[PDB]
CSV table of C-alpha atoms and ligand atoms in Angstrom, one decimal:
chain,number,residue,atom,x,y,z
U,67,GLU,CA,0.7,23.5,25.1
U,68,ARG,CA,-2.5,21.8,23.9
U,69,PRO,CA,-3.4,23.7,20.7
U,70,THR,CA,-6.8,25.3,20.4
U,71,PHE,CA,-9.1,23.3,18.2
U,72,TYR,CA,-12.0,24.5,16.0
U,73,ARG,CA,-15.0,22.7,14.7
U,74,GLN,CA,-16.5,22.4,11.2
U,75,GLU,CA,-18.9,20.1,9.4
U,76,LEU,CA,-17.7,18.6,6.1
U,77,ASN,CA,-20.0,16.2,4.2
U,78,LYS,CA,-21.9,15.1,7.3
U,79,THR,CA,-18.7,14.6,9.4
U,80,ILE,CA,-17.6,16.9,12.2
U,81,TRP,CA,-13.9,17.8,12.0
U,82,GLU,CA,-12.3,19.2,15.1
U,83,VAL,CA,-8.7,20.2,14.4
U,84,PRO,CA,-5.9,22.5,15.6
U,85,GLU,CA,-6.1,26.1,14.3
U,86,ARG,CA,-2.8,25.5,12.5
U,87,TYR,CA,-4.7,23.5,9.9
U,88,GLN,CA,-6.7,25.7,7.5
U,89,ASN,CA,-8.8,25.4,4.4
U,90,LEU,CA,-9.9,21.8,4.9
U,91,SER,CA,-11.5,20.3,1.8
U,92,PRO,CA,-12.8,16.8,1.4
U,93,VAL,CA,-10.6,14.5,-0.7
U,94,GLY,CA,-12.0,11.0,-0.1
U,95,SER,CA,-14.3,9.0,2.1
U,96,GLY,CA,-15.0,5.3,2.9
U,97,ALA,CA,-16.3,3.0,5.7
U,98,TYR,CA,-13.1,3.4,7.8
U,99,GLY,CA,-12.7,7.2,7.5
U,100,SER,CA,-12.4,10.4,5.5
U,101,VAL,CA,-9.6,12.5,4.3
U,102,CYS,CA,-9.3,16.3,3.7
U,103,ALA,CA,-6.6,18.4,2.1
U,104,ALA,CA,-5.5,21.4,4.3
U,105,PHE,CA,-2.8,24.0,4.6
U,106,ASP,CA,-0.6,23.7,7.6
U,107,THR,CA,0.2,27.3,8.7
U,108,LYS,CA,2.9,26.1,11.1
U,109,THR,CA,5.0,24.3,8.4
U,110,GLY,CA,3.8,25.9,5.2
U,111,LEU,CA,3.0,22.4,3.9
U,112,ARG,CA,-0.1,21.2,2.1
U,113,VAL,CA,-1.3,18.2,4.1
U,114,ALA,CA,-3.8,15.4,4.0
U,115,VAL,CA,-5.7,14.9,7.2
U,116,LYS,CA,-7.4,11.5,7.8
U,117,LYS,CA,-10.2,11.3,10.4
U,118,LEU,CA,-10.8,7.7,11.3
U,119,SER,CA,-14.5,6.8,11.4
U,120,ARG,CA,-15.4,5.5,14.9
U,121,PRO,CA,-12.0,4.0,15.4
U,122,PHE,CA,-12.9,2.2,18.6
U,123,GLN,CA,-16.3,0.8,17.6
U,124,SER,CA,-15.1,-2.8,17.6
U,125,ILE,CA,-12.0,-4.9,18.3
U,126,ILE,CA,-11.2,-5.0,14.6
U,127,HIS,CA,-11.5,-1.3,14.2
U,128,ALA,CA,-9.6,-0.5,17.5
U,129,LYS,CA,-6.8,-2.8,16.4
U,130,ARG,CA,-6.8,-1.4,12.9
U,131,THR,CA,-6.5,2.1,14.3
U,132,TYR,CA,-3.7,1.0,16.6
U,133,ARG,CA,-2.0,-0.8,13.6
U,134,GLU,CA,-2.1,2.2,11.3
U,135,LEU,CA,-0.8,4.6,13.9
U,136,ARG,CA,2.1,2.1,14.7
U,137,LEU,CA,2.9,1.8,11.0
U,138,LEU,CA,2.9,5.5,10.1
U,139,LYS,CA,4.9,6.4,13.2
U,140,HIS,CA,7.6,3.9,12.1
U,141,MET,CA,7.8,4.8,8.4
U,142,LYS,CA,10.8,7.2,7.9
U,143,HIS,CA,11.9,6.9,4.3
U,144,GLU,CA,11.8,9.2,1.2
U,145,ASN,CA,9.6,6.8,-0.8
U,146,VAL,CA,7.0,5.9,1.9
U,147,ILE,CA,4.3,8.0,3.4
U,148,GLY,CA,5.3,9.4,6.9
U,149,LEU,CA,3.4,10.9,9.8
U,150,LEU,CA,3.6,14.7,10.0
U,151,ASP,CA,1.2,14.9,13.0
U,152,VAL,CA,-1.4,12.9,14.9
U,153,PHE,CA,-3.9,14.5,17.2
U,154,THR,CA,-7.1,14.1,19.1
U,155,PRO,CA,-9.4,16.9,20.6
U,156,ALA,CA,-9.7,14.6,23.7
U,157,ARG,CA,-8.0,16.0,26.8
U,158,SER,CA,-7.9,12.6,28.5
U,159,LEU,CA,-8.1,8.8,27.9
U,160,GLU,CA,-11.7,9.0,29.2
U,161,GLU,CA,-12.6,11.5,26.5
U,162,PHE,CA,-10.7,9.8,23.7
U,163,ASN,CA,-12.9,8.7,20.8
U,164,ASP,CA,-11.4,10.2,17.7
U,165,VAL,CA,-8.0,10.0,15.9
U,166,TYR,CA,-6.7,12.2,13.2
U,167,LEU,CA,-3.6,11.5,11.1
U,168,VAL,CA,-1.6,14.1,9.1
U,169,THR,CA,0.7,13.5,6.2
U,170,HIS,CA,2.1,15.3,3.2
U,171,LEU,CA,-0.6,15.9,0.6
U,172,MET,CA,-0.2,14.3,-2.7
U,173,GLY,CA,-2.8,14.8,-5.5
U,174,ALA,CA,-1.4,12.9,-8.4
U,175,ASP,CA,-1.3,9.1,-8.2
U,176,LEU,CA,0.3,6.7,-10.7
U,177,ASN,CA,-3.1,6.4,-12.6
U,178,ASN,CA,-2.9,10.1,-13.3
U,179,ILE,CA,0.6,9.6,-14.7
U,180,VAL,CA,0.0,6.4,-16.8
U,181,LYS,CA,-3.3,7.7,-18.4
U,182,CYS,CA,-2.2,11.3,-19.1
U,183,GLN,CA,1.6,11.3,-19.5
U,184,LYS,CA,3.8,9.6,-22.1
U,185,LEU,CA,6.3,7.9,-19.9
U,186,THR,CA,9.7,7.2,-21.4
U,187,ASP,CA,11.7,4.1,-20.3
U,188,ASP,CA,13.7,6.6,-18.2
U,189,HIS,CA,10.5,7.6,-16.4
U,190,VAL,CA,9.6,3.9,-15.9
U,191,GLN,CA,13.1,3.2,-14.5
U,192,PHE,CA,12.8,6.1,-12.0
U,193,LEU,CA,9.3,5.3,-10.9
U,194,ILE,CA,9.8,1.5,-10.5
U,195,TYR,CA,13.2,2.2,-8.8
U,196,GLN,CA,11.5,4.4,-6.2
U,197,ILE,CA,8.8,1.8,-5.5
U,198,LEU,CA,11.5,-0.9,-5.0
U,199,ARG,CA,13.6,1.4,-2.8
U,200,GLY,CA,10.5,2.1,-0.7
U,201,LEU,CA,9.5,-1.6,-0.7
U,202,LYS,CA,13.0,-2.8,0.4
U,203,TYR,CA,12.5,-0.5,3.4
U,204,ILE,CA,9.0,-1.7,4.2
U,205,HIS,CA,9.9,-5.3,3.8
U,206,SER,CA,13.0,-4.9,5.9
U,207,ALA,CA,10.6,-4.2,8.8
U,208,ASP,CA,8.6,-7.4,8.0
U,209,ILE,CA,5.7,-5.3,6.9
U,210,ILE,CA,3.7,-6.6,3.9
U,211,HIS,CA,1.8,-3.9,2.0
U,212,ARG,CA,-0.6,-6.4,0.3
U,213,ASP,CA,-2.5,-3.7,-1.8
U,214,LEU,CA,0.0,-2.1,-4.0
U,215,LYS,CA,-1.7,-0.5,-7.0
U,216,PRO,CA,-1.4,2.8,-8.9
U,217,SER,CA,-3.9,4.6,-6.6
U,218,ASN,CA,-1.7,3.8,-3.6
U,219,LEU,CA,1.4,5.4,-5.2
U,220,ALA,CA,1.6,9.2,-4.9
U,221,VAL,CA,3.8,11.0,-7.6
U,222,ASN,CA,4.7,14.6,-7.7
U,223,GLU,CA,5.6,16.9,-10.6
U,224,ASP,CA,9.3,15.9,-10.4
U,225,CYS,CA,8.2,12.1,-10.7
U,226,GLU,CA,9.1,11.7,-7.0
U,227,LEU,CA,7.1,8.8,-5.6
U,228,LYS,CA,5.8,7.6,-2.2
U,229,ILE,CA,4.1,4.4,-1.3
U,230,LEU,CA,1.0,4.7,0.9
U,231,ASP,CA,-2.4,3.0,1.6
U,232,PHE,CA,-5.4,5.2,0.9
U,233,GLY,CA,-7.6,2.4,2.0
U,234,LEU,CA,-10.8,3.7,3.5
U,235,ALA,CA,-12.7,0.7,2.3
U,236,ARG,CA,-13.1,-2.9,3.5
U,237,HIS,CA,-11.9,-5.1,0.6
U,238,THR,CA,-15.2,-7.1,0.9
U,239,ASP,CA,-16.0,-9.9,-1.4
U,240,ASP,CA,-18.2,-7.6,-3.4
U,241,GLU,CA,-15.3,-5.1,-3.7
U,242,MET,CA,-13.0,-7.7,-5.2
U,243,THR,CA,-15.7,-9.0,-7.6
U,244,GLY,CA,-15.9,-8.4,-11.3
U,245,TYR,CA,-14.0,-6.1,-13.6
U,246,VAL,CA,-12.3,-4.1,-10.9
U,247,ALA,CA,-8.8,-2.5,-10.3
U,248,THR,CA,-9.1,-3.6,-6.7
U,249,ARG,CA,-8.1,-7.1,-7.8
U,250,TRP,CA,-6.0,-6.6,-11.0
U,251,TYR,CA,-2.7,-6.1,-9.1
U,252,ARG,CA,-3.1,-9.0,-6.6
U,253,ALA,CA,-0.7,-12.0,-6.5
U,254,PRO,CA,-2.6,-15.1,-7.5
U,255,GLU,CA,-1.8,-16.8,-4.1
U,256,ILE,CA,-3.7,-14.1,-2.3
U,257,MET,CA,-6.4,-13.6,-5.0
U,258,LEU,CA,-7.3,-17.3,-4.7
U,259,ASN,CA,-6.2,-18.0,-1.2
U,260,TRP,CA,-3.7,-20.7,-2.3
U,261,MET,CA,-1.5,-20.8,0.8
U,262,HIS,CA,-0.1,-18.6,3.5
U,263,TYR,CA,1.4,-15.7,1.7
U,264,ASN,CA,4.3,-13.5,2.6
U,265,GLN,CA,6.0,-10.3,1.4
U,266,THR,CA,6.6,-11.7,-2.1
U,267,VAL,CA,2.9,-10.8,-3.0
U,268,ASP,CA,4.1,-7.2,-3.2
U,269,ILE,CA,6.7,-8.0,-6.0
U,270,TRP,CA,3.9,-9.4,-8.1
U,271,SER,CA,2.0,-6.1,-7.8
U,272,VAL,CA,5.1,-4.2,-8.8
U,273,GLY,CA,5.5,-6.4,-11.9
U,274,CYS,CA,1.8,-5.6,-12.8
U,275,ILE,CA,2.4,-1.8,-12.2
U,276,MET,CA,5.7,-1.9,-14.3
U,277,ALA,CA,4.0,-3.6,-17.2
U,278,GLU,CA,1.2,-1.0,-17.2
U,279,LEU,CA,3.7,1.9,-17.1
U,280,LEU,CA,5.5,0.3,-20.1
U,281,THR,CA,2.3,-0.4,-22.2
U,282,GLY,CA,-0.3,2.1,-20.8
U,283,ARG,CA,-2.6,-0.9,-20.3
U,284,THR,CA,-3.6,-3.0,-17.4
U,285,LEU,CA,-1.7,-6.3,-17.4
U,286,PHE,CA,-4.3,-8.6,-16.0
U,287,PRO,CA,-7.7,-6.8,-16.4
U,288,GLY,CA,-9.8,-9.9,-15.4
U,289,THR,CA,-13.5,-9.7,-15.6
U,290,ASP,CA,-13.6,-11.9,-12.4
U,291,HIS,CA,-11.3,-14.0,-10.3
U,292,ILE,CA,-11.2,-17.0,-12.8
U,293,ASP,CA,-10.9,-14.9,-15.9
U,294,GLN,CA,-8.0,-13.1,-14.2
U,295,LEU,CA,-6.3,-16.4,-13.3
U,296,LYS,CA,-6.6,-17.5,-17.0
U,297,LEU,CA,-5.0,-14.2,-18.1
U,298,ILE,CA,-2.2,-14.8,-15.6
U,299,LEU,CA,-1.6,-18.4,-16.6
U,300,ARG,CA,-1.6,-17.6,-20.3
U,301,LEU,CA,1.3,-15.2,-19.8
U,302,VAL,CA,3.4,-17.0,-17.1
U,303,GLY,CA,2.3,-20.6,-17.8
U,304,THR,CA,0.3,-23.1,-15.8
U,305,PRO,CA,1.9,-24.3,-12.5
U,306,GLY,CA,4.3,-27.2,-12.4
U,307,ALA,CA,4.1,-30.0,-9.8
U,308,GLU,CA,6.5,-28.3,-7.4
U,309,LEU,CA,4.2,-25.2,-7.1
U,310,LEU,CA,1.1,-27.4,-7.0
U,311,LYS,CA,2.2,-29.1,-3.9
U,312,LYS,CA,2.7,-25.7,-2.3
U,313,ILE,CA,-0.9,-24.8,-2.9
U,314,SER,CA,-2.1,-26.0,0.5
U,315,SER,CA,-5.8,-25.2,-0.4
U,316,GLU,CA,-6.9,-28.5,-1.7
U,317,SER,CA,-9.9,-27.1,-3.5
U,318,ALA,CA,-7.8,-24.4,-5.2
U,319,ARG,CA,-5.2,-27.0,-6.1
U,320,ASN,CA,-7.8,-29.3,-7.6
U,321,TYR,CA,-9.3,-26.4,-9.7
U,322,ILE,CA,-5.9,-25.2,-11.2
U,323,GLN,CA,-5.1,-28.8,-12.2
U,324,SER,CA,-8.4,-28.9,-14.2
U,325,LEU,CA,-6.8,-26.4,-16.7
U,326,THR,CA,-5.1,-27.4,-19.9
U,327,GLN,CA,-1.4,-26.9,-19.5
U,328,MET,CA,0.2,-23.8,-21.1
U,329,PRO,CA,3.8,-22.7,-21.5
U,330,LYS,CA,5.2,-19.3,-20.3
U,331,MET,CA,4.9,-16.9,-23.3
U,332,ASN,CA,7.8,-15.0,-24.8
U,333,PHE,CA,7.7,-11.6,-23.0
U,334,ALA,CA,9.6,-9.9,-25.8
U,335,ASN,CA,6.7,-10.7,-28.0
U,336,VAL,CA,4.3,-9.4,-25.3
U,337,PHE,CA,6.1,-6.2,-24.4
U,338,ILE,CA,7.0,-5.2,-28.0
U,339,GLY,CA,9.8,-2.7,-28.2
U,340,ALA,CA,10.5,-2.6,-24.5
U,341,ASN,CA,14.0,-2.3,-23.2
U,342,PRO,CA,15.3,-5.9,-23.0
U,343,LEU,CA,16.4,-5.3,-19.4
U,344,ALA,CA,12.8,-4.3,-18.5
U,345,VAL,CA,11.6,-7.5,-20.2
U,346,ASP,CA,14.2,-9.5,-18.1
U,347,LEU,CA,13.1,-7.8,-14.9
U,348,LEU,CA,9.4,-8.4,-15.6
U,349,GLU,CA,10.2,-12.1,-16.2
U,350,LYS,CA,11.8,-12.2,-12.7
U,351,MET,CA,9.0,-10.4,-10.9
U,352,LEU,CA,6.0,-12.2,-12.6
U,353,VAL,CA,6.9,-15.8,-11.5
U,354,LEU,CA,4.0,-17.8,-10.3
U,355,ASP,CA,5.9,-19.5,-7.5
U,356,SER,CA,6.4,-16.7,-5.0
U,357,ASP,CA,9.5,-18.5,-3.5
U,358,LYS,CA,11.2,-17.8,-6.9
U,359,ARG,CA,10.3,-14.2,-7.4
U,360,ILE,CA,13.0,-11.5,-7.3
U,361,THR,CA,13.1,-9.6,-4.0
U,362,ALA,CA,13.0,-5.8,-3.7
U,363,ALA,CA,16.7,-5.8,-2.5
U,364,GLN,CA,17.7,-8.1,-5.4
U,365,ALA,CA,15.7,-6.0,-7.9
U,366,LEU,CA,17.5,-2.7,-6.9
U,367,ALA,CA,20.8,-4.3,-8.1
U,368,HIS,CA,19.3,-5.3,-11.5
U,369,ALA,CA,20.9,-3.6,-14.6
U,370,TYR,CA,17.7,-1.9,-15.6
U,371,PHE,CA,18.2,0.5,-12.7
U,372,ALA,CA,22.0,1.1,-13.3
U,373,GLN,CA,21.3,4.8,-13.7
U,374,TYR,CA,19.7,5.1,-10.2
U,375,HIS,CA,21.0,2.3,-8.0
U,376,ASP,CA,23.1,3.5,-5.1
U,377,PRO,CA,23.8,0.7,-2.6
U,378,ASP,CA,24.8,3.4,0.0
U,379,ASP,CA,21.5,5.1,-0.2
U,380,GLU,CA,18.9,2.3,-0.2
U,381,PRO,CA,18.3,2.2,3.6
U,382,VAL,CA,16.5,-0.4,5.7
U,383,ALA,CA,14.0,0.2,8.6
U,384,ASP,CA,14.6,0.3,12.3
U,385,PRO,CA,13.3,-2.8,14.0
U,386,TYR,CA,9.5,-2.8,14.1
U,387,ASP,CA,7.9,-4.8,17.0
U,388,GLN,CA,4.6,-6.3,15.7
U,389,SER,CA,4.2,-8.7,18.6
U,390,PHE,CA,0.8,-6.9,19.1
U,391,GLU,CA,-0.4,-8.6,15.9
U,392,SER,CA,-0.8,-12.0,17.7
U,393,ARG,CA,-2.2,-10.4,20.9
U,394,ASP,CA,-5.9,-10.4,21.8
U,395,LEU,CA,-7.0,-7.4,23.8
U,396,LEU,CA,-10.3,-5.7,24.7
U,397,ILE,CA,-11.4,-2.5,22.8
U,398,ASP,CA,-10.4,-0.3,25.7
U,399,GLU,CA,-7.0,-1.9,25.9
U,400,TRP,CA,-6.3,-1.2,22.1
U,401,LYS,CA,-7.7,2.3,22.8
U,402,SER,CA,-5.3,3.0,25.7
U,403,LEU,CA,-2.4,1.6,23.6
U,404,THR,CA,-3.4,3.9,20.8
U,405,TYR,CA,-3.8,6.9,23.2
U,406,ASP,CA,-0.2,6.3,24.5
U,407,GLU,CA,1.1,6.4,20.9
U,408,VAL,CA,-0.8,9.6,20.1
U,409,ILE,CA,0.6,11.2,23.3
U,410,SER,CA,4.2,10.1,22.6
U,411,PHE,CA,4.4,11.3,19.0
U,412,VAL,CA,7.3,13.6,18.2
U,413,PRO,CA,7.0,15.4,14.8
U,414,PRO,CA,9.6,15.2,12.1
U,415,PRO,CA,12.3,17.8,12.8
E,206,EDD,C1,2.3,1.9,3.3
E,206,EDD,C2,1.9,1.3,4.6
E,206,EDD,C3,3.0,1.7,5.7
E,206,EDD,C4,1.7,-0.2,4.6
E,206,EDD,C5,0.6,1.9,5.1
E,206,EDD,C6,0.3,3.3,5.0
E,206,EDD,C7,-1.0,3.4,5.6
E,206,EDD,N1,-1.8,4.5,5.8
E,206,EDD,C8,-1.8,5.6,5.0
E,206,EDD,O1,-1.1,5.7,3.9
E,206,EDD,N2,-2.7,6.6,5.4
E,206,EDD,C9,-3.0,7.7,4.7
E,206,EDD,C10,-3.1,7.8,3.3
E,206,EDD,C11,-3.5,9.0,2.7
E,206,EDD,C12,-3.7,10.2,3.4
E,206,EDD,C13,-3.6,10.1,4.8
E,206,EDD,CL1,-3.8,11.5,5.8
E,206,EDD,C14,-3.2,8.9,5.4
E,206,EDD,CL2,-3.0,8.9,7.2
E,206,EDD,N3,-1.4,2.2,5.9
E,206,EDD,C15,-2.6,1.8,6.4
E,206,EDD,C16,-3.8,2.3,6.0
E,206,EDD,C17,-5.0,1.9,6.6
E,206,EDD,C18,-5.0,0.9,7.6
E,206,EDD,C19,-3.8,0.4,8.0
E,206,EDD,C20,-3.8,-0.7,9.0
E,206,EDD,C21,-4.2,-2.1,8.5
E,206,EDD,N4,-3.6,-2.5,7.3
E,206,EDD,O2,-5.0,-2.8,9.0
E,206,EDD,C22,-2.6,0.8,7.4
E,206,EDD,N5,-0.4,1.2,5.6
């Protein structure tokens, strides 16, 4: 009933996996783990296998491990990554120190698309439609992605798209510094820690992604946090008093008021030649005040997606209990919770 596992070393990491998974090759690595492509001989699928790096080394790691397993086990939607398998070579809780996660392999991400391909407005409609369909689902579970960007969007040959998070890195201060794509898609309220944020950050990211699909260029390629803010405020205008009072960070508020006031620009003169409906949708996503941004559910009903929108096939998630988020436990308690979730996993039929 327990499969047989075999061992191999790949780039200084030992991988111990069931025999069903063959031809493992390294695909990515970071502080939190490593990923290989493989062939699943049981299902005939090409898969990605993520080996978490010392998942129970600390409370933050143990909870992160638990969190990712909880999320992936819940995600059951065409446009969101799902869990094919989860395994450990451990035969008991006492032996349990490693966690491996298995999903559908994707190679191509949206960067591959935007920089190689010439996307028509039809392609842009279909790609952004699928992001929004996925996001409606994710948000319906009160899950916030927070790191939407082209490298976290997998896209196949038929332009079919899935949202994931390939994050093997700590978004450290250094990682968010300078002329870096790690920060270019972030809502300004989270980039600058303006206030307590919510799921609306993800819609800002979608606006940035949609713009870049339309133009082939990064929307806000800031050289640093402040330069990026300036690029943002140039396009969308400086904040009015109503938004300024919502910036609960007094230092951040005081800074943004130092800036000379600027009006929102004409997006038709920015996105020259774009479908007017794309321009209208961008205007509704790229609103500084996150309270006033369009939601994923609202966006799906926008005329730009008339060709794709089916209100009977834009499903919501089952209830997702994230009461664990506010719970403090010891490493071994997070570990046993995680082990229970590994043990209870039922594969997709
Ligand atoms: C889209 C959604 C549901 C918010 C998501 C997918 C995901 N994990 C992956 O997408 N994992 C993954 C990616 C590429 C290949 C493979 Cl094998 C995996 Cl398991 N997520 C995810 C990734 C790393 C950590 C955490 C937990 C945390 N945020 O602290 C979650 N989050």
